[PDB]
Amino acid sequence: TFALDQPSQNQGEIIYIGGGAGFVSKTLHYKSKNRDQARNDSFDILKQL
RNA sequence: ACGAGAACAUACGUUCUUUGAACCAAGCUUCAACUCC
Numbered sequence: 900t901f902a903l904d905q906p907s908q909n910q911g912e913i914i915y916i917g918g919g920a921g922f923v924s925k926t927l928h929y930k931s932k933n934r935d936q937a938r939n940d941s942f943d944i945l946k947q948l
Numbered sequence: 949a950c951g952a953g954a955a956c957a958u959a960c961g962u963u964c965u966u967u968g969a970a971c972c973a974a975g976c977u978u979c980a981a982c983u984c985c
Contacts, residue, residue: 915962917980917983919982919983919984920982921983921984922983922984924970925980925982925983926959944983944984945984947984948984948985
């Protein structure tokens with residue numbers, strides 16, 4: 900249902916169709932930002948809106 | 949009172965006949981109705 904849904908079967912993969920999925924789904928600068936991504940996303944979204 | 953005096957370089961006549969402004973050519977390419985409260 901909603902617990903993890905990733906590691907059971909990686910077969911039958913997942914795409915997001917944009918029904919209000921969020922900022923994280925639309926943006927993509929991942930590698931290799933782990934916490935730099937989180938703090939830059941927080942500053943960008945929160946400071947302007 | 950002249951190598952002189954008279955004497956239209958004039959008459960008739962289509963700048964005309966034949967002929968494609970044509971030929972080849974995607975209004976197309978990359979594009980989430982989405983984002984945050």
